[PDB]
Amino acid sequence: MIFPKQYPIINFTTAGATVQSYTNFIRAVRGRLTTGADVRHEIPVLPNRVGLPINQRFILVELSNHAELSVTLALDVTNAYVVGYRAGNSAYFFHPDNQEDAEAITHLFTDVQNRYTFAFGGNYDRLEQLAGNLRENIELGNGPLEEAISALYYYSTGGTQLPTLARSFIICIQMISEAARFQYIEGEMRTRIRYNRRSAPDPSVITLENSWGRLSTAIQESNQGAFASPIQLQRRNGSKFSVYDVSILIPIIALMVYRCAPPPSSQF
Numbered sequence: 001m002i003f004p005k006q007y008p009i010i011n012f013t014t015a016g017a018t019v020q021s022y023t024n025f026i027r028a029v030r031g032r033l034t035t036g037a038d039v040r041h042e043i044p045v046l047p048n049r050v051g052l053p054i055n056q057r058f059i060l061v062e063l064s065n066h067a068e069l070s071v072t073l074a075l076d077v078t079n080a081y082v083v084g085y086r087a088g089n090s091a092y093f094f095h096p097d098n099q100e101d102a103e104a105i106t107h108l109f110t111d112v113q114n115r116y117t118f119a120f121g122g123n124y125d126r127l128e129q130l131a132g133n134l135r136e137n138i139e140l141g142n143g144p145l146e147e148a149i150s151a152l153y154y155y156s157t158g159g160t161q162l163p164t165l166a167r168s169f170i171i172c173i174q175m176i177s178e179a180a181r182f183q184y185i186e187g188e189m190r191t192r193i194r195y196n197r198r199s200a201p202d203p204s205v206i207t208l209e210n211s212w213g214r215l216s217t218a219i220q221e222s223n224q225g226a227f228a229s230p231i232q233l234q235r236r237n238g239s240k241f242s243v244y245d246v247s248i249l250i251p252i253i254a255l256m257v258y259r260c261a262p263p264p265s266s267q268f
């Protein structure tokens with residue numbers, strides 16, 4: 001048997017944030033997401049969801065800000081993605097895709113008075129619609145993150161519009177989940193922090209985000225790194241190009257979702 005155990009907690013604050021504090025935060029996220037024992041083409045693979053002990057399924061990210069408010073995000077270790085959050089006496093979860101995932105989230109934030117699962121999932125297509133803006137028009141950086149934290153904090157008490165909540169999720173997901181998944185996106189956020197800049201992601205970032213699952217599959221199914229079919233990405237100017245091999249992505253992608261295929265049939 002395995003006894004229940006508090007999930008790992010990683011902390012970040014926008015108050016006095018630096019390139020170093022952000023870098024150390026993303027390092028901590030990647031470290032708590034991975035075992036270090038499953039690494040393919042120098043890129044860590046996340047734990048497999050199937051049969052994963054519930055104590056190992058999630059990590060918590062506690063976010064604080066200049067307003068002296070705090071919220072805690074839950075990340076799914078199997079895909080690095082935000083599944084919900086807690087603030088004060090309330091927790092909110094994105095709609096799970098299946099009954100196994102719905103059961104898993106019952107182990108999160110089990111001390112809160114009020115638990116709610118949204119009807120909607122946390123996918124960008126839906127969140128962008130709710131926000132009323134595409135990712136290409138939602139600024140990222142320490143300023144946006146500061147205000148996103150406050151929006152999440154005040155949601156339960158009626159302080160936050162649905163579009164603002166959705167926009168705030170979009171900000172947090174990219175600055176935390178996508179930054180953990182991609183050194184390239186971490187670098188994008190580091191540069192914003194370095195210059196106290198706010199700016200929306202360019203097509204290179206957006207296409208990487210969109211392609212993360214496909215890239216994970218392509219890399220893990222590759223023949224000594226060579227892809228079985230190319231993956232299309234975009235340059236910063238939006239121009240399309242194809243990737244055929246893991247080599248070019250080793251400095252770009254930091255985590256992959258676990259992939260496997262069942263055996264071929266062994267009987268007629």
Ligand SMILES: NC(=O)c1cccc2c1-c1ccccc1C2=O
Pocket residue numbers: 067147148150151152154159160161164
């Ligand atoms: N527009 C917002 O991000 C927002 C939504 C709900 C509550 C708050 C905010 C917001 C933005 C900037 C400073 C403070 C706050 C405040 O706590």
Ligand SMILES: [Cl-]
Pocket residue numbers: 004005054107
């Ligand atoms: Cl438990």
Ligand SMILES: [Cl-]
Pocket residue numbers: 014015016017
């Ligand atoms: Cl500061």
Ligand SMILES: [Cl-]
Pocket residue numbers: 105106115117
């Ligand atoms: Cl629940």
Ligand SMILES: [Cl-]
Pocket residue numbers: 007107108109110
């Ligand atoms: Cl928890």
Ligand SMILES: [Cl-]
Pocket residue numbers: 119120121122123126
């Ligand atoms: Cl949805």
Ligand SMILES: [Cl-]
Pocket residue numbers: 123124125126
């Ligand atoms: Cl999407």
Ligand SMILES: [Cl-]
Pocket residue numbers: 132133134137
């Ligand atoms: Cl838009």
Ligand SMILES: [Cl-]
Pocket residue numbers: 139143144198
């Ligand atoms: Cl903004």
Ligand SMILES: [Cl-]
Pocket residue numbers: 139198199200
């Ligand atoms: Cl911009």
Ligand SMILES: [Cl-]
Pocket residue numbers: 242243244245248
């Ligand atoms: Cl290539």
